[PDB]
């Protein structure tokens, strides 16, 4: 029942849903925040 706005809230922000991170998709898409040096970050494990 919400129609009245504040100022410039009508400014379009996005049309595609992007609420697809971490618990939203049952942990399918992980959005962490950690630094890492260089253009590559590789981890080695036994075959």
């Amino acid at each position: 029942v919400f129609n009245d706005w504040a100022y410039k809230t009508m400014s379009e922000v996005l049309d595609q849903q992007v609420e697809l991170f971490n618990g939203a998709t049952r942990g399918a898409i992980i959005l962490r925040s950690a630094g890492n040096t260089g253009d590559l970050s590789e981890a080695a494990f036994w075959a």
Binding site: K8, S11, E12, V13, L14, D15, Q16, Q17, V18, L20, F21, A24, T25, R26, G27, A28, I29, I30, L31, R32, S33, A34, G35, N36, D39, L40, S41, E42, A47
Partner: protein, 214 residues
């Protein structure tokens, strides 16, 4: 005159959108390079409510439990809705025609990312790819920078806003072939297969599978 605030709002939204879209495109390309794709375009109309998902389960094999989500475009969801709304085989009642899951306990998450759609008219193909526990990893690196710089030499003082940031992509059991790819890949460089090596020995360890429907 709230240009900075407006740009901030739109930039937060589009940053979320861009990381999500790049992750989806990289995941689809990597799974296609790994062979975990089921192409359903010739059978009947092109998409079935539930019998199509069994194909992806057959692909992923004995570890079918490890898939618990179906990222999909909106058109496949509406096709499931329509076929469910016309139950040629009577397994729905009017109170259950709006099921979002896939009759296996896996919810279907809906987004209209351009990475999950391609072609037009009769070549239109939709990718509805399922995931595993933490299959696609996106790690933003906390290096956001932004400036506002004025310009001199034109008829008006040209003001500018420029930003920059970075993040990291990782798909379970897959490595980005930097030799065939590049140091800094474009969004279309991630979507190109043969740049995604299959590290894990078995397809089961690799997290995800792609379902292609028209």
């Amino acid at each position: 005159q709230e240009a900075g605030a407006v740009i901030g709002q739109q930039l937060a939204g589009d940053t979320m959108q861009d990381m999500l879209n790049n992750g989806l495109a990289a995941g689809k390309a990597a799974f296609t390079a790994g062979g975990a794709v089921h192409d359903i375009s010739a059978a009947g109309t092109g998409l079935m409510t539930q019998r199509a998902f069994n194909a992806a389960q057959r692909i992923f094999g004995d570890r079918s439990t490890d898939i618990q989500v179906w990222v999909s475009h909106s058109s496949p969801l509406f096709d499931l809705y329509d076929n469910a709304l016309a139950n040629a085989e009577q397994l729905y009642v009017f109170g259950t025609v709006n099921v979002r899951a896939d009759a296996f306990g896996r919810p279907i998450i809906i987004t209209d990312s351009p990475a999950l759609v391609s072609g037009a008219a009769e070549t239109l193909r939709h990718s509805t790819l399922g995931l595993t526990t933490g299959a696609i990893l996106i790690e933003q690196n906390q290096d956001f920078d932004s400036t506002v710089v004025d310009g001199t030499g034109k008829q008006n003082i040209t003001r500018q806003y420029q930003a920059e940031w970075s993040y990291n992509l990782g798909v379970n059991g897959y490595a980005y072939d930097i030799a065939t790819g590049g140091k800094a890949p474009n969004p279309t460089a991630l979507a190109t297969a043969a740049n995604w090596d299959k590290i894990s020995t078995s397809i089961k360890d690799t997290g995800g599978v792609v379902l292609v429907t028209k």
